[PDB]
Amino acid sequence: ISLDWSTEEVIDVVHFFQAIEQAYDQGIAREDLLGKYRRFKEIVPSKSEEKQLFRAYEQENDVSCYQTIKKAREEMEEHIQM
Amino acid sequence: TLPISLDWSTEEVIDVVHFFQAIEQAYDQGIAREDLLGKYRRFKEIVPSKSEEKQLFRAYEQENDVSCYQTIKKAREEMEEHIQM
Ligand SMILES: [Mg+2]
């Protein structure tokens, strides 16, 4: 059973997608991006919901939320640029 | 015609498992268009190669009465949210 979001949670999710965009712009610190992702997953624990949000966001933006986060999780590079 | 070998992470294996389960769900009680496509999108993140995708669909369909192509095609082209094959 899923839980509805508080206004604070909505903002945290907005910040997450803005972090993804930042990765494709001037870049973002690994620690920053992972922190935004950690928070995103606290709010969206469902793997299915995550996939739906990622696809919906990518429909209008030429980015890959999955590949960006995968890189941040697996690589030790301090600065991430997609 | 090269013999395919797949190198996926643990989570990616499960993402692929969820994709095929999604296709099966479409033939059972049905599934939401958005969920199905979300899982197909992830499948393509893991299997960007069209040749690998084609062979995986074939491998699954050889033992399961479903059509990955028909299901995703219908989902992509039609607007109804509830998809049932
Ligand atoms: Mg409710």
Side-chain angles (χ1 to χ4, degrees), chain A:
Chain A
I1 170 179
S2 99
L3 245 184
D4 294 329
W5 301 353
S6 65
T7 57
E8 303 96 287
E9 294 179 311
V10 170
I11 304 313
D12 291 335
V13 171
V14 172
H15 289 345
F16 169 73
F17 286 106
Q18 285 173 142
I20 292 299
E21 281 306 333
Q22 195 180 317
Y24 287 77
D25 191 32
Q26 64 268 166
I28 184 169
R30 183 195 188 194
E31 49 265 51
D32 182 358
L33 182 57
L34 289 183
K36 299 286 173 58
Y37 182 59
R38 172 187 170 176
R39 180 54 178 153
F40 171 83
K41 289 304 296 179
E42 281 172 29
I43 300 165
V44 185
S46 170
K47 188 67 61 61
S48 301
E49 189 179 356
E50 166 185 297
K51 294 173 183 179
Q52 288 178 51
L53 284 167
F54 282 14
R55 180 189 160 267
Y57 188 76
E58 290 162 20
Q59 187 170 177
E60 305 97 317
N61 301 281
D62 174 55
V63 304
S64 170
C65 298
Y66 179 69
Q67 294 306 331
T68 301
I69 294 302
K70 181 182 177 63
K71 176 170 295 184
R73 287 176 67 182
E74 311 179 335
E75 308 196 308
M76 295 191 81
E77 320 303 301
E78 300 179 64
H79 183 263
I80 299 172
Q81 176 77 61
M82 300 297 287

Side-chain angles (χ1 to χ4, degrees), chain B residues 52-67:
Chain B
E52 296 182 355
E53 168 181 16
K54 187 177 58 192
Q55 295 308 301
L56 282 165
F57 285 179
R58 188 198 197 71
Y60 189 76
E61 291 168 27
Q62 190 165 172
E63 305 179 60
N64 298 281
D65 203 336
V66 302
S67 174

